[PDB]
Each structure stands twice: as C-alpha cells, then as structure tokens.
C-alpha cells in the first residue's frame, strides 16, 4: 500500500 | 491528522505507526493495514454507523478535500510495496481518483462520521481501509  | 482519534483510541495505518503506537498497542491487523493504540486524552472523532458509499476525504498530495464514491469493502489483491509483500488486503474500499505516495492517512468522512482511511492507491484508484465494523471504538 501507500504512506510515502 | 494522519489519524482517527475516537474515545481513548488512536487509529492509524499500520505502516505509518510510530514506536509510541506499538508501545501502546490495543489492536492491529496486517491484512487491513490498521493499527489502534491507546491515548490519555479524549478524541474528537466518531466512527460512522452506516453503509454510506459516498463521502469526502482529504488528499495529502493535493492538499484538498475531494468528494468521492467508493465500493463496498472487499478482498483486494495488492501489489508488493516497500511496506508489504504482494497480498490480499481485506475491507478495502476502492474509488476513482487522484492518488500518490504519501496520501495514506487521509480520513474519509460521510455525514455520519469517520468511514475509513486512505491505505493504498494506484492505477487511477484510491483504496480506503474501512473502519465502520470497529464498533468497540465507540
Ligand atoms: Zn454515512
């Protein structure tokens, strides 16, 4: 998934 | 933000969790990308008790609120990232919309309260982790  | 604050609970994306989160762990699920930790202060959010499939979420990369329509929560195959191997993610709601690295953590709301949190995205889709089944949060 995400979180960057 | 980047987090849902309800009751004495802090809800975040599991891969965005801090050390303090794990130290104060209440509950986590890799397959949902969710982690909940305890707080001392009382939180201001309420989890939506509904089956709404439209709402508004905050997009980090754009710095804007966007109205969105999203599918009912489901098992979705998600490609490897630097946070997980390729896997099935459960309770993932999908939407058409703009999506970038760093948008995870944006909160999705309807008129009933908090519905979920951006977890994944790509190929013109934004993936939201549904939190409405977590009735014990309220
Ligand atoms: Zn609703």
As beta bridge partners, residue B2 has: none
**Which residue, B117, B97, B91, is CA-closest to B1?**
B117
Q: Which two tokens stand for residue B43?
A: 């939180």
Final resolution, Å: 2.2
Q: How is residue B101 written in tokens?
A: 């690295």
- Contact residues on chain A for B13, CB-CB shorter than 8 A: 1-3
Hey, is A3 helix, strand or coil? coil
C-alpha B114 chain-centroid distance: 9
B13 touches B120 (CB < 8 A): no
Give the closest-approach CA distance of B3 to chain A in angstroms: 12
Q: Quick one: B107 exposed, middle or buried, by C-beta within 10 A (0-12, 13-18, 19+)?
A: buried
Q: Flag if A1 and B105 touch (Cβ within 8 Å).
A: no
Q: What tokens were used for B11?
A: 């809800």
Sign of the CA dihedral with B29 first, then B34, B36, and B37 last: positive
| Cα Rg of chain A, angstroms | 4
- Residues B97 and B68: their CA atoms lie apart, in Å, by 8
CB < 8 Å to B16, chain A: 3
Distance between CA atoms of B94 and B123, rounded to whole angstroms? 11
**A1 Cα to chain B: minimum distance (Å):** 4
Q: How was this structure determined?
A: X-ray
Residue B113 neighbours by CB distance under 10 Å:
19
Tokens of B54: 């439209």
| CA nearest neighbour of B69 among B48, B106, B94 | B94
- Nearest chain A Cα to B83, which residue? A1
Q: What CA–CA distance (Å, rounded) separates B14 from B44?
A: 21
Beta bridge partners of B58: B65
CB contact under 8 A, B103 and A1: no
Q: What is the 3-state secondary structure (H, E, C) of chain B?
A: CCCEEEEEEEEEEHHHCCHHHHHCEEEEECCCCEEEEEEEEEEECCECCCCCCEEEEEECCCCEEEEEEECCCEEEEECCCCCCCCEEEEEEEEEECCCCCCCCCCEEEECCEEEEEEEEEECCEEEEEECCCCHHHC
């Amino acid at each position: 998934f995400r979180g960057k | 933000s980047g987090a849902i604050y309800v009751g004495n609970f802090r809800v975040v994306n599991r891969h965005l969790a801090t050390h303090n989160d794990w130290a104060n762990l209440v509950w986590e699920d890799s397959s949902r990308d969710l982690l909940v930790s305890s707080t001392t202060a009382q939180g201001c959010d309420t989890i939506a008790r509904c089956n709404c499939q439209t709402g508004v979420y905050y997009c980090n990369s754009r710095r804007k609120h966007y109205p969105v329509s999203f599918s009912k929560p489901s098992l979705i195959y998600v490609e490897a990232s630097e946070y997980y191997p390729a896997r099935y993610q459960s309770h993932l709601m999908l939407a058409q919309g703009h999506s970038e690295p760093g948008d995870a953590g944006g909160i999705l709301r309807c008129q009933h309260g908090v519905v979920g949190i951006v977890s994944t995205g790509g190929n013109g889709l934004v993936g939201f982790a549904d939190v409405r089944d977590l009735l014990w949060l309220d």
